[PDB]
Design a binder for this molecule. Sequence first.
Ligand SMILES: [Cl-]
Ligand SMILES: [Cl-]
Lengths: 412, 413
Amino acid sequence: AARLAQVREEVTAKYAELKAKNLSLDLTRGKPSAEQLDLSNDLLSLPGGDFRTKDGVDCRNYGGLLGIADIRELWAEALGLPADLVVAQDGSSLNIMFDLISWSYTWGNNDSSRPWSAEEKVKWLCPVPGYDRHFTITEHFGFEMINVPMTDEGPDMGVVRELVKDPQVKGMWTVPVFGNPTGVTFSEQTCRELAEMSTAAPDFRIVWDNAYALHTLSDEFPIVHNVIEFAQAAGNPNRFWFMSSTSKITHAGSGVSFFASSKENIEWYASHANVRGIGPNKLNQLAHAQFFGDVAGLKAHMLKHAASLAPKFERVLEILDSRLSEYGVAKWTSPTGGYFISVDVVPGTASRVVELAKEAGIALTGAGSSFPLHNDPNNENIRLAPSLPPVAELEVAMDGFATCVLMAALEV
Amino acid sequence: DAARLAQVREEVTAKYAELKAKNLSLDLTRGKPSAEQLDLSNDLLSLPGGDFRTKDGVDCRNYGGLLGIADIRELWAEALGLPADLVVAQDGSSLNIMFDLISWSYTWGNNDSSRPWSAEEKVKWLCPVPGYDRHFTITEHFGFEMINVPMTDEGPDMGVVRELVKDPQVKGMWTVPVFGNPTGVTFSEQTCRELAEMSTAAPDFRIVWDNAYALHTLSDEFPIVHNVIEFAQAAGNPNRFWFMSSTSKITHAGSGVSFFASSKENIEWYASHANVRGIGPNKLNQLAHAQFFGDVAGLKAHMLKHAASLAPKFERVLEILDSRLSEYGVAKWTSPTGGYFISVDVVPGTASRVVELAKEAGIALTGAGSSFPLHNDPNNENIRLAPSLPPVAELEVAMDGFATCVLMAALEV
Ligand SMILES: [Cl-]
Ligand SMILES: [Cl-]
């Protein structure tokens, strides 16, 4: 191992050379770049004096709880769902997912014998690495979260099947297409099993958070599996709460959110929503419907995002390969869509990699942030977020990240 | 009163006879702005356009910001005379926030709770009546036991409120403190002061100070917006008030912006849950509203345009009632100088009959009891009128028909 003393010397030299660049970069922001945002500049002036829906309804006034037909029909077609199964709300699907759990907790859902608050304990399945904002909701509700391994075609179905036999298990978080942060899209097989399987809880819900349903890096769109109709045809019609939104399509924060589910789930939702409010922002929905025009226009707009994003992911992936490959030090996802790359480093070092990057002026997401309670049991995983920075910055940041990964690896 | 009212017997049978003949299809039901009012805000439909940054230069197109952009907070706060750091601006509906406040207090308690309201055997809630059906529906939904409080020319009967709050099961109160829906009354300063000063048995008692009509005057003069958050601070009950307001009847109803104002402690608590619910509200719509109004003067100028459109409509119904019911002592009615409604108390036991007679003659009146918890007006006497939407032509036939229905139903008891 005279090569070990040589490699840690050349790696130490690269870390010193990295510190000397006096960087200030971050691979932290899972949001659209200004370039991507500029693609929706026309939406900022809409709807103007064209404030009526196709059908002739004045969107400037009260009324309509489930969103306007113009946007609901457009969006349902794009996802391949029937329009009456799709609800359009305000600018956050996270808002809806919280309400869905909040209302199950307070009142029970339409399949509950008792509100989830009346249970001794509530357990919740958490496929990992996953989305911190998901886990924050179930943590806030005091649900006992149970981690479930991700495979390359979705969650470990041998684990899901065994765990769901526990009647305290009330639900599950999923990101089923171009998943945050892993990039995997659940196979049809996996989609069908989740719809078919028996659960001990009679009111088990899967949050099918389809955030990236249209969000390709290439020329091709993923299939959106109609899990709702798998559910119906399998005898479990109410199993999926199907989420999607325009946050990373238009303006992240001032977009349109969508909830799709069975008829009975939508009626349950509405019975509470009806109390909470008169209904969503119809003028924003109209503007969005006018802006996309049709499914064809939506998809055209998705391919411009693709164009902006694709070179960034390609650069990142080549640097990971070129800089880390021969070493046997890291594995990473090669997503074909979405907003993220998930990297697994030498177990026990993820934390040190992040600290080493910070000290060299590169900001990385805190190790374990893809996990419930921010705890990665193996201390191996780091999420990368390449959507915002210019490719020139990504190159430097990603050089350094690779240096930090190797430094950490060679410090034990 | 009942002596001369009878002498008008056949003549009234006629009016109705005649009125049914006209084959009407009118509606006094909608607390919505007219198309003419909505038009006032058409410029806002094209905003912000290429002007997508706040004044401090923050890009409103991307994620971030939980409590609303400074531009709108600062402007609304100034308009209400409140500290901008105690004003929160959210999405299109303040009813949503009122629901969230109550919901989060039911699930996890509020910052002053020792236990969540869901763990209580009973939760009691003070309901000044006549009041607002969407308020009452929220507390009905949570299964609260609602107790009616008499409303006076200057707010709730405080002798009643002060006795009731001695009960630790009483958790809170619905109020519409300026140009109240449906009564038109604005709580006097004294009443505002008693509300913040009184001691309650519940340590976590909350008043929903739903200031939906804080600026919505029918004249050229604006009402005083008493700073109840300050009152409460000085009275040593700093967290009592959840102060609500909205642009719903100012810009576009349902696509506007809502505001929650409170003590700092109440906002931090609100933020710890709202932080879990989402990243934050629609900033671009907040920016468009901020650019549209421009300043407080711009906002108040626009309210006066609303006043312009609404005043002749309210003036009309009030002369139609006075000149057409006053002599008979059959109905009493509010004469509001702002807000959206007129509340009429007809002879006890005939309200439902009035609504019925009107419906048959082709006029939609708000359901009897709908200003009361559980839609129960125990005297069957109150009807809510909503003059805002119809053109003065439609309104004038409707108000004459209505006054006929009151006269018919009285000849029935
Ligand atoms: Cl089911
Ligand atoms: Cl207090």
